[PDB]
């Protein structure tokens, strides 16, 4: 039985994990302003996520399948990020209002980078009608919105058509979405919601997008390069620079034996995880 | 929030009046806006309250044919109106913000008073 | 719902406890409010919800509520407590104020 662990998180087989630090799984993959260090991710072998991470969705809401989500992101080692619809590509649309106190970046406010937050302009709202075509020969993951607005005067001062519906569909996707306009209670100081939802388009399929008002449109997606046993680890120890073939989430396993009693939670090539505190085979006989 | 009316008015009887108050913005929490009768000497009588965000209005059974509520939503102002003035209306009038259905604890009602208009 | 308050004057020296009393005529179920008004000036709340006072009343104010009755009570009286108390409820609508109470130097 091994009891010990050098504490540290560690490489896995040279492969340095990606630590989001203080932002969540949400907050990486939505592009919040506090967590622009992981712009550009290289390949990792897990992910480390903390408990209670500070910087998550920074504009309340939800997102739709997160545990969904976070249990496909532990198959996957890398993500190439793409522009697909470019923030120059919407001339009858303001992209450049849509930003938010709850979302700050170093003190102005900001809005999420991977997605824009459409606003009228001319005091117009064109319907959007917009189509991308996955010719990547990988998963695309994509990742859009809807906004919940408080009243029919912010409503109208946000998005000038008082009735609105985002409409979504792929090969299998048929989504319909309607904002719901109503009181709500201030989380980061906004009353408003956002509801971001994700997919997984195919190398040879269209995501159609159709919407009056209300959309957080996607900027930019992510190609599925790499795929293969990972794991996301809830874990608030340091990365100490080792490399090791077995991590916990208290510490990295240096170990031949088939047994520890680490932690039940493991990645790579480890002992068998027993909660007992003595486990010794006698070889020989008795003493005198 | 803060409350601003208009100034005194010195009218003869039979004619129409509008006073206004003003201060409130589209406030997310629901409110109501209410006008208030002070007769000089005598006590309060609340006339009538509206919700600037619907134009839904509450009158007194004493103020309900007499009185005239009304909001303009665009510039957030609420009106007091009299088609007929007489000599009985000679009062001070304030405009009073408070909230509109809010309750905290076992079942207390947040509807006080909270901020008047001079 | 009628709240009668009692008295209408009251001479009370500067320094020492005034008592204010507001009957209603139903249950307002501590849904009672006082204000206080000097002259030419709009009421400014003092107690809501019959004993809890607003921001910046000193503690001397105390509010009390015994089934309908309800008692304001003020002590050590400085020179700014002498102006007219309402009690309003709003426990219903319409919303029903107190004749008033008159506080006086002596």
């Known amino acids: 039985l091994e009891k010990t662990h050098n504490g540290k998180l560690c490489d896995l087989n040279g492969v340095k994990p990606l630590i989001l630090k203080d932002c969540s799984v949400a907050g990486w993959l939505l592009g919040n302003p506090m967590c622009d260090e992981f712009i550009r991710v290289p390949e990792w072998s897990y992910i480390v996520e903390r408990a209670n991470p500070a910087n998550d969705l920074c504009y309340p809401g939800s997102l739709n399948d997160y545990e969904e989500l976070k249990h496909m992101l532990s198959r996957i080692n890398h993500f190439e990020k793409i522009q697909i619809i470019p923030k120059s590509s919407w001339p009858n649309h303001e992209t450049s209002l849509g930003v938010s106190a709850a979302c700050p970046y170093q003190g102005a406010p900001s809005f999420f980078r991977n997605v824009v937050w459409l606003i009228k302009k001319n005091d117009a709202y064109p319907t959007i009608k917009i189509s991308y075509n996955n010719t990547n020969r990988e998963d695309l993951l994509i990742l859009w919105g809807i906004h919940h607005s408080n009243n029919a005067e912010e409503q109208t001062n946000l998005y000038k058509n008082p009735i609105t519906y985002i409409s979504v569909g792929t090969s299998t996707l048929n989504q319909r979405l309607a904002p719901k306009i109503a009181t709500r209670s201030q989380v980061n100081g906004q009353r408003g919601r956002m509801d971001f939802f994700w997919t997984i388009l195919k190398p040879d399929d269209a995501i159609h997008f159709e919407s009056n008002g209300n959309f957080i449109a996607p900027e930019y997606a992510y190609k599925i390069v790499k795929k293969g046993d990972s794991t996301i680890m809830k874990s608030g120890v340091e990365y100490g620079h080792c490399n090791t073939k077995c991590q916990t989430p208290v510490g990295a396993i240096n170990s031949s034996m088939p047994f520890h009693n680490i932690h039940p939670l493991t990645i790579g090539e480890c002992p068998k995880y027993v909660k007992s505190n003595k486990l010794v085979l006698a070889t020989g006989l008795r003493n005198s | 929030v803060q409350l601003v009316q208009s100034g005194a008015e010195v009218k003869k009887p039979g004619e129409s009046l509008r006073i206004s108050c003003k201060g409130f913005a589209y406030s997310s929490t629901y409110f109501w806006i209410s006008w208030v009768r002070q007769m000089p000497g005598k006590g309060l009588e609340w006339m009538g309250r509206?919700?600037?965000?619907?134009?839904?209005?509450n009158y007194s059974p004493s103020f309900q044919g007499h009185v005239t509520i009304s909001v303009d939503r665009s510039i957030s102002t609420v009106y007091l109106q009299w088609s007929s003035l007489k000599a009985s209306d000679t009062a001070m009038y304030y405009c009073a913000y408070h909230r509109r259905g809010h309750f905290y604890g076992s079942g207390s009602a947040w509807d006080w008073f909270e901020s008047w208009g001079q | 719902i009628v709240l009668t308050q009692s008295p209408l004057t009251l001479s009370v020296s500067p320094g020492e406890r005034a008592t204010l009393s507001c009957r209603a005529s139903?249950?307002?179920?501590?849904?009672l409010a006082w204000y206080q008004q000097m002259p030419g000036q709009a009421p400014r709340l003092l107690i809501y919800g019959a004993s809890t006072r607003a921001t910046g009343i000193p503690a001397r104010l105390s509010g009390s509520a015994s089934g309908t009755e309800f008692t304001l009570t003020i002590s050590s009286l400085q020179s700014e407590d002498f102006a007219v108390y309402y009690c309003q409820q709003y426990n219903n609508w319409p919303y029903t104020f107190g004749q008033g109470t008159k506080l006086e130097i002596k």
């Open positions: 139903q249950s307002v179920s501590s849904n």
């Open positions: 509206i919700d600037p965000t619907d134009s839904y209005i």
